Design a protein around this ligand. Structure first.
Ligand SMILES: N[C@H](CO)Cc1c[nH]c[nH+]1
Ligand SMILES: [Cl-]
Ligand SMILES: [Cl-]
Ligand SMILES: [Cl-]
Ligand SMILES: [Cl-]
Ligand SMILES: [Mg+2]
Ligand SMILES: [Mg+2]
Ligand SMILES: [Zn+2]
Ligand SMILES: [Zn+2]
Lengths: 160, 158
């Protein structure tokens, strides 16, 4: 079973450059082509898993209610359009917490470590996503809106 | 002559709030099933898209422009980022009691188009959308999430 482990902020949707928190609806923006390209990937047999660090989620620095509006709308778009994430895995911790689950640690995905490692990938926009791939023993794809975008990924991962 | 789809917004592209028929909060925004992939399919088949919507009392106390703008502009972001493009977004802001010239199924908003009529459609969830189609002299599709939905329309028209 081929899996795609996909980052949220800066990958599925844009990441706010001020505080890196999608905590208002006016900070929610989808990356280009993510919907048709995830549908394409699913049709080729990939299952999808979302994996994301959300520093301080559920605390006064990033209230659960502030995260929920934009996140739930994002998920309603995916689901209604036919994009299904098997799991949405979140680390809510601060870096200083030194938790077991903050990417690039693999705790959140331990159950997948089970899958076809040769044909599974982490997709994310940061060095930490690529390091997660290395820690998982799978391939890493560094999302970039210009140099490795959703259409390119959809093509690359369905090449035969 | 261009094939057009004239598509209603509320209850057709996005869910219609059952409470009060106004998408006036972000938390009332929800996309209809399959609308994105199907509109992309329809665009690839050569249809151009025009949105047309009655927004009762838009820009007054019971529906401020600012309340409409947030959810609408976000809906537009989502469609545009995913490759769905509307040539025009046509809005009637008036109350029914106003008895204006632009309220569907009156044809004012779309006068310019009055187009390959044999292959153009109004798609909407209300009888008035179907009447608009008749007044424009083109085909009408009565969108229903359960019985005549986006995958069905995408299949039929391609
Ligand atoms: N957006 C970052 C990565 O997903 C996590 C974060 C939340 N608050 C501040 N930083
Ligand atoms: Cl910002
Ligand atoms: Cl992250
Ligand atoms: Cl969020
Ligand atoms: Cl209407
Ligand atoms: Mg990221
Ligand atoms: Mg309607
Ligand atoms: Zn953690
Ligand atoms: Zn009017």
């Amino acid at each position: 079973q081929k899996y795609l482990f996909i980052d949220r902020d800066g990958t599925l949707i844009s990441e706010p450059p001020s505080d890196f928190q999608v905590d208002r609806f006016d900070k929610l923006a989808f990356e280009p082509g993510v919907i048709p390209q995830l549908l394409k990937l699913q049709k080729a047999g990939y299952k999808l898993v979302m994996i994301t660090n959300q520093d301080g989620l559920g605390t006064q620095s990033f209230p659960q209610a502030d995260f929920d509006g934009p996140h739930n709308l994002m998920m309603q778009i995916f689901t209604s359009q036919g994009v299904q994430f098997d799991e949405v895995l979140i680390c809510p911790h601060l870096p200083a917490d030194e938790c077991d689950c903050r990417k690039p640690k693999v705790k959140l995905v331990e159950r997948y470590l089970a899958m076809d490692r040769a044909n599974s990938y982490v997709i994310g926009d940061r060095a930490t996503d690529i390091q997660l791939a290395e820690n998982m023993g799978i391939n890493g794809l560094r999302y970039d809106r210009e140099t490795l975008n959703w259409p390119m990924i959809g093509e690359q991962l369905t090449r035969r």
